[PDB]
Amino acid sequence: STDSIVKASNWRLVEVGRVVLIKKGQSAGKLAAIVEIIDQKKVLIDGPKAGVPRQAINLGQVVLTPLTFALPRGARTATVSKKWAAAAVCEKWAASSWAKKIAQRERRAALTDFERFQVMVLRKQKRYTVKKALAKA
Amino acid sequence: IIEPSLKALASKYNCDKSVCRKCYARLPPRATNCRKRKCGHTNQLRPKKKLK
């Protein structure tokens, strides 16, 4: 065909309204959103839903999300929480495979040996079904 | 027997050049500095002297 073809790296851009995960620090396991940029490696964030205070940070302690919402620059924390709720971004985050695996391993940590034996027996029964299931087909 | 057009044409390749006063290299005539590391990429150059 005549159609020119290219792949372009679809990167998570650093921007305003961009929601982020905290990797390190006291707010590990939390989410927040950017307000403003300072340099290549420094930004300003707030996690009022998550309960993070408005603050600057280096980006090494943080990973971007694939998610993002609409937000003007310099938004104070109240407006930030407002737009966060309006966009319903934590809801959307919960539907991630990412958050699900996270809460999964959180459970896996929280398990009790009784529950682990339960898990074992359940795996065994599931497997007994699945073997003869994947015998005929 | 040999004509001035191709004379100048060849001079582009043999004469119309510049020379390092240190690295003795054969440089583009309009260059400012020597492209050679050993002379410190210096600026002290000259033109290749002309014949007769």
Added chain:
Amino acid sequence: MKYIQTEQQIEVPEGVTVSIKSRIVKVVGPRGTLTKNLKHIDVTFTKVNNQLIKVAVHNGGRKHVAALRTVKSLVDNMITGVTKGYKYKMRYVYAHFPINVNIVEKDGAKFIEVRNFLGDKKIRNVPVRDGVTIEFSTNVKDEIVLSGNSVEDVSQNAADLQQICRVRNKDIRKFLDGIYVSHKGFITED
């Protein structure tokens, strides 16, 4: 100062196509096809339409930036070659000894053959690259031409023919003989 974003722009005209995948470039047009690999540069691309591409660098230094332009220029050179073609005319030069020039094929090798350079008994043989084609001029004397879509091969075999007939031990300012590039342009638009 680590420029945060810079970019250059590339036009794609009608009848042309391009395919980019992991810095592996195919460029197809009427003359044929041309391929290249640019994995030795870390850069991004973007089709915006079938008429334009952007190339871009994020957060690059000075020398990192510099490659964007030459890469763009190289792409443009490929495009111009696959559409218009490239054509490099030289001229022979001599004052006493007539430079004898022919072509000759060893197992289809197509070596250019040169004799009588300054009266030498030496026969010089220069292979012909692929995709490049040669014509002796008839309307005008001693004007032999190369042409092809690959500027690299064209220019290189041309300069091969240049530097192969390099005089030794003699004041070239007087001894100007050789073969010298007079003109370079395209096959198309004359």
Added chain:
Amino acid sequence: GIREKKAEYFAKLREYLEEYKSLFVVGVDNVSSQQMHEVRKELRGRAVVLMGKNTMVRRAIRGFLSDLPDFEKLLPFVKGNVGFVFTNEPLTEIKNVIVSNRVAAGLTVVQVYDNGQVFPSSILDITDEELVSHFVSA
């Protein structure tokens, strides 16, 4: 000096924005130096034409808002290789001598300004057959 030369240009512009009641913003795109001169000798009757840097045209007209406030709306029309033909003669005469006579197509009339009014120069060429349909049909 050069700023005085910019001032030298600004003065003649105000000289003609004030001395003349009308002006024709004319497209001087593509007009030759010989075509610009032959427009003068025909315009030596009334009209005087003033060229310069459009940026100096706008920056000159931008400065004229204390008095001459209705000159504000020339600035949307200070674009491209264009120029003013300041004149007091009637509309269609200078308009035709600009547009029809000594034209090579190729100078048109971009805008005609007079007493804080804007004409698109199209109804300006209305010869007849427009008032009869208005007066008779009314």
Added chain:
Amino acid sequence: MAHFKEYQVIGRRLPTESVPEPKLFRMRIFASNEVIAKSRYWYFLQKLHKVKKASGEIVSINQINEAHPTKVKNFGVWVRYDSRSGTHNMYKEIRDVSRVAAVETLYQDMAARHRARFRSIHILKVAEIEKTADVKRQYVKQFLTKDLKFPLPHRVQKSTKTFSYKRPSTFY
């Protein structure tokens, strides 16, 4: 030479019977404690007037917090620094949130690009640029462009373990 703080330090000659109520001088000092602050205060006051710590007195040392430690600001800093064979004046622009963070980054940057040390550096002025386009420097201006966005390519996983089983990716 640590994470800094800003103090205002007010100090005075000792009062005499001749001259009581001497002429309170204040300074804004970037330093990591009041001790260093008082030291530098006397350093500078010695340089300007015929006074020293022995004939003088410090009236008050007060820490100044930023008024808006979250609003991202653009500072201009006028600096004096001793080189190896000379001393020089500078104006540098820094986009950061607080004066103190700007000063931290400035000392690191001058040590990096000039191998200058704190002992060698005098800070003449720190001033906020209220309006953009009064900024003079491109490496700050490229962040003031409207609706700025860019990615962070080549994300590297610092690994908890020594061994991995799958050649990771720089996608991000």
Added chain:
Amino acid sequence: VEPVVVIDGKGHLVGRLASVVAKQLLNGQKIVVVRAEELNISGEFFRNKLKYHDFLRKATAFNKTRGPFHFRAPSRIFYKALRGMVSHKTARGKAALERLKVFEGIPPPYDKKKRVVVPQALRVLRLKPGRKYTTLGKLSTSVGWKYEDVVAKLEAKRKVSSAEYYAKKRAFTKKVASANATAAESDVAKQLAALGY
């Protein structure tokens, strides 16, 4: 955490890898390395080659054959590099070395085994892009090593067989992910998921 540790030479950095291998041996893990020729070395070929040549001229002047031994082959290159990081004149160091194995390409007894990677030693991870570097097979065959082309031949021979195996396994996993979803929609699966599985 294993009896054996099989490692790919590819994409790594020599000294980094050698340090970590050294400490792992001296803690007592048994290690084995493959595809050494695919090592990456920082800095360009010319610099690395000059450094080898300087290393190469140094010899016991009165008798060359007892002096330093200038092994060319990439395996022995990494071997030397790592021996520099060990008290190999110890019986403990000699034990640590006996715990080690190194290979070019990847022979049968390991190619059918899992083999792993060491992020602290990876070029792309550690070494900044925009920087040049060097390939160990190129350097070795430059400086007197012979058997490169053989490695290409054997490794392609292997890789085809590996591809067939992987695709065969993939079809089986697709079968699995098909036949298991039906039980994924089952009460036991629901309970396991409630438990975090």
Added chain:
RNA sequence: AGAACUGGCGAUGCGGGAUGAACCGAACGUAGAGUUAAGGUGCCGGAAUACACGCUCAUCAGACACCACAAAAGGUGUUAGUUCAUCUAGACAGCCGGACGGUGGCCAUGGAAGUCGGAAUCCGCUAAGGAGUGUGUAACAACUCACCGGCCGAAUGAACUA
């Protein structure tokens, strides 16, 4: 080689300085536990391939006081900075339009109309225009610059410093 003050070595082990009489730390009964020193934490080697800001890529890098050396002079390599200058009354760069009239200005000649050469550098209209910076014709035709204007819109040049 010879002096002043002090501290050391000699008469003194120890930890570090790889090695080392004198340096750094510290001075010693025999043992244990804890905390440090100077010094160090990729591996040899015990200790973070810790964090952060930036600089640097060397066809001869650099890598720790004592200490095991280096300069003068240079560099359109790179970084950062100072002074000056052009420029938002629109600059530079780059594109773009005019590149005229008195006028083919005067001599030179087979022809030389702004561009083989020799001699004058004048005037008009001009936003501006050289009696032309050049390609091209046998010579005109046909373009581009000097100079000026449309476009973008804030940059552009030089000399310096480390």
Added chain:
RNA sequence: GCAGUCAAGCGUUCAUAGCGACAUUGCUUUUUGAUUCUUCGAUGUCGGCUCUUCCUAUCAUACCGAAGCAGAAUUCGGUAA
């Protein structure tokens, strides 16, 4: 002993093709000195011969650059032991 910087000047003109005053920074330990650390209950204290190797600041040979290189010849210089 050797190498650099600057360049008034030579080089018909032309500082720098090649030279280069006035100064001036360095390198080497094959000169000779200075010192006297080691050895005087003992290092066999010129030169030659024979023989192996190392250096390069290359005399020749390889490939090259520059010239006041027309050619021939010669010079300056480079990667090179």
